Amino acid sequence: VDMYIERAGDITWEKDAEVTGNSPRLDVALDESGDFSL
Amino acid sequence: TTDGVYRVMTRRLLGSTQVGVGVMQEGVFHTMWHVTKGAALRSGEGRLDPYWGDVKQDLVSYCGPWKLDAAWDGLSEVQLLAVPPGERAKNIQTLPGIFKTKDGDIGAVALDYPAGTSGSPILDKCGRVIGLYGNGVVIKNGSYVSAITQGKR
Ligand SMILES: CN(C)Cc1ccc(C(=O)Nc2cc(Cl)cc(C(=O)NC(C)(C)CO)c2)[nH]1
Ligand code: NA
């Protein structure tokens, strides 16, 4: 078995986390292979 | 098998390489199909076997059915709990955009991380997992926009 998992953290909301990224409204297609495109 | 966020690692390539990220909740490991392609996983001396998967949703669950059922409210800021290769887990807060599809609207997070970050969980203000980051599109800039990909429970 080639693949393995390592714990990286707890799943918690962090008050006063770094706030960034934009919020685009995009027109997309989802093909049978699970690829998104514009 | 403790609840939390996990790196998915392989020793097939050079050194130890991070292929992606997943979520352990209710004894089930959750990641994106393209991270593992449905392969078995090692956990200490334990082995995790795939239970459910779908290439089109790009999700897979190990040791049981998909458990994550919370949804984006369509209104509020969320946090990406990004786990980048070789770097600490880090909460990034953002307002999702939208993917408009012929079959309805999904949340979208516009944050640039390496491909090895696929499967990082997205959180609501109560800490609940509303989906996984790491399947999406490269836009004009050269930047990445991920679906908020949630399975069915
Ligand atoms: C799921 N299958 C069928 C489709 C597929 C192939 C690849 C993907 C996919 O979404 N890959 C991916 C995931 C992530 Cl988290 C980041 C980047 C990325 O290129 N990020 C940059 C900021 C540009 C830095 O390299 C790319 N989906
Ligand atoms: Na396989």
Curated annotation (Swiss-Prot), chain A:
Entry coiled-coil feature ranges: none
Top-level division of the source organism's lineage: Viruses
Region (Interacts with and activates NS3 protease): 5-38
Bilayer topology: Multi-pass membrane protein
Region named Disordered: 9-31
Protein location: Host endoplasmic reticulum membrane
Cytoplasmic topological segments: 1-38
Function as written in the Swiss-Prot or TrEMBL entry: Required cofactor for the serine protease function of NS3.
Domain notes: The central disordered region transitions to ordered by binding to NS3.
Quaternary structure (record): Forms a heterodimer with serine protease NS3. May form homooligomers. Interacts with human SPCS1. Interacts with non-structural protein 2A.
Protein name: Serine protease subunit NS2B
From Swiss-Prot, chain B:
Localization per Swiss-Prot or TrEMBL: Host cytoplasm; Host endoplasmic reticulum membrane
Active site, renumbered: H34, D58, S118
Positions of the Peptidase S7 domain: 1-153
Membrane topology: Peripheral membrane protein
PTM comment text: Acetylated by host KAT5. Acetylation modulates NS3 RNA-binding and unwinding activities and plays an important positive role for viral replication.
The protein's role, per its UniProt record: Displays three enzymatic activities: serine protease, NTPase and RNA helicase. NS3 serine protease, in association with NS2B, performs its autocleavage and cleaves the polyprotein at dibasic sites in the cytoplasm: C-prM, NS2A-NS2B, NS2B-NS3, NS3-NS4A, NS4A-2K and NS4B-NS5. NS3 RNA helicase binds RNA and unwinds dsRNA in the 3' to 5' direction. Leads to translation arrest when expressed ex vivo. Disrupts host centrosome organization in a CEP63-dependent manner to degrade host TBK1 and inhibits innate immune response. Inhibits the integrated stress response (ISR) in the infected cell.
Subunit structure: Forms a heterodimer with NS2B. Interacts with NS4B. Interacts with unphosphorylated RNA-directed RNA polymerase NS5; this interaction stimulates RNA-directed RNA polymerase NS5 guanylyltransferase activity. Interacts with non-structural protein 2A. Interacts with host SHFL; this interaction promotes NS3 degradation via a lysosome-dependent pathway. Interacts with host CEP63; this interaction disorganizes the centrosome and inhibits host innate immune response.
Protein name: Serine protease NS3
Gene source species: Zika virus (ZIKV)
